[PDB]
Design an enzyme around this catalytic site. Structure first.
Site, PDB file in Angstrom:
ATOM      1  N   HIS B  57       0.576  -1.696  -0.001  1.00  0.00           N
ATOM      2  CA  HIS B  57      -0.016  -0.004   0.123  1.00  0.00           C
ATOM      3  C   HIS B  57       0.689   1.229  -0.431  1.00  0.00           C
ATOM      4  O   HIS B  57       0.188   2.546  -0.457  1.00  0.00           O
ATOM      5  CB  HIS B  57      -0.625  -0.105   0.713  1.00  0.00           C
ATOM      6  CG  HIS B  57       0.290  -0.076   2.209  1.00  0.00           C
ATOM      7  ND1 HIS B  57       0.157  -0.385   2.697  1.00  0.00           N
ATOM      8  CD2 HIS B  57       0.045   1.749   3.330  1.00  0.00           C
ATOM      9  CE1 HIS B  57       1.120  -0.412   3.803  1.00  0.00           C
ATOM     10  NE2 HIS B  57       0.416   1.139   4.221  1.00  0.00           N
ATOM     11  N   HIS B  72       2.179   7.261  -0.087  1.00  0.00           N
ATOM     12  CA  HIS B  72       1.702   6.017   0.974  1.00  0.00           C
ATOM     13  C   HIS B  72      -0.282   6.625   1.262  1.00  0.00           C
ATOM     14  O   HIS B  72      -1.050   7.003   1.465  1.00  0.00           O
ATOM     15  CB  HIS B  72       1.610   7.025   2.665  1.00  0.00           C
ATOM     16  CG  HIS B  72       0.916   5.321   3.494  1.00  0.00           C
ATOM     17  ND1 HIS B  72       0.000   5.486   4.521  1.00  0.00           N
ATOM     18  CD2 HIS B  72       1.528   4.879   4.125  1.00  0.00           C
ATOM     19  CE1 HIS B  72      -0.408   5.116   5.466  1.00  0.00           C
ATOM     20  NE2 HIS B  72       1.129   3.768   4.638  1.00  0.00           N
TER      21      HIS B  72
END
Lengths: 150, 150, 150
Positions: B57, B72
């Site tokens: 992720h 992020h």
């Protein structure tokens, strides 16, 4: 030199490989991370235990040599609220390499924690001229994980 | 100038608006955040992919121009343990603006992640003389999100 | 001096005692933490409210005296997604010591949050010559928690 002995067994992983920003990005300090393979978190240095997380999954320690380190079991371990960790040492206690700090249930933690990756970081980098990171398999209280030049 | 293109579509939000201390307080770097509206995380710069979170992720990237950025997805996404994210690129790979890094399931992640707010941050601020933040709606690999003066 | 009044009641705890790395390690600032015993988060200083987490569990505030502080309810509170917190103030609002910022459900939050430990931290330490931390029991909007010399 000053040498940091494995606070726990497993495989050395790079700090940058820990799926947590605070650790991966070296915000707290630089160091290595260990993928645990055992059941106790031991003192990596000769010194004085500083802090013990109330959740018993992390601790600090300042070596006699002026090295300040922080060991944190897993990522988000605070969720477990203490489950899986038994605290053997006391905040303030003076310890020696190999001395037990925390005992943990590897198979439980392994099934209920985001990650078991254990960061071993040097909190006072600024006191640090050289940091050498070793690699491979390490065994509790024996194998050196990092070497520093003050 | 150096210009940073949207690594994902959605609406630009301010960094300070992300419900996470590490990001809101600019502890990692400064930048913008995007509320996603699509399904792929693309390279914002021409350069070399650095790191890819094992949970797929988040990733880093260093532009040819010396700009180091970190993208992020969401807040606490590590919980998902990888669910919802497909990794198209490789750590080390050399990419170009618009190049796919990660593919993600927007409706799943949207229902199981604390937040989908995606911070786009500049890790090497100290190399940074000027940072200009644009606003509004952005589209993957096209719209510029930030402009920097080195 | 400048004095910081309790933004909430409870017992003063040391920052270092908060089971969170970002806080325990003073990465955001230094300060104290409070174990809450009540139901409202009030302004500790006379000034202007800065930011309010969308999850309503944290806020910033800049005093007229140039003191910048951040108050964060609990550890990982973002999980709750807002449950348990009622926001009385507005980002930007000018307030005075004792002025209500957030109202919270102590018994719910207490049963569903990793921790209710509330860090009160000074974000602009560099502007700070002296920081004195008091201890003991504090009462909302009255008891001073910290004293600083600018």
């Amino acid at each position: 030199t000053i040498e940091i002995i494995a606070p726990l067994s497993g495989e050395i992983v790079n700090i940058e490989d820990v799926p947590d920003v605070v650790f991966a990005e070296k915000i707290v300090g630089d160091g290595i991370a260990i993928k645990p393979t055992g059941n106790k978190m031991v003192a990596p240095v000769d010194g004085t235990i500083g802090k013990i997380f109330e959740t018993n999954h992390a601790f600090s320690i300042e070596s006699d040599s002026g090295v300040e380190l922080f060991v944190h079991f897993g990522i988000d371990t605070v969720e477990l609220k203490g489950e899986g960790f038994k605290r053997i040492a006391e905040e303030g206690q003076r310890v020696k390499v190999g001395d037990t700090v925390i005992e943990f249930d590897l198979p439980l933690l392994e099934e209920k924690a985001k990650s078991t990756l254990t960061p071993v970081v040097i909190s006072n980098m600024d006191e640090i001229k050289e940091l050498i990171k070793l690699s491979g398999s390490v065994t509790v209280g024996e194998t050196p994980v990092i070497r520093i030049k003050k």
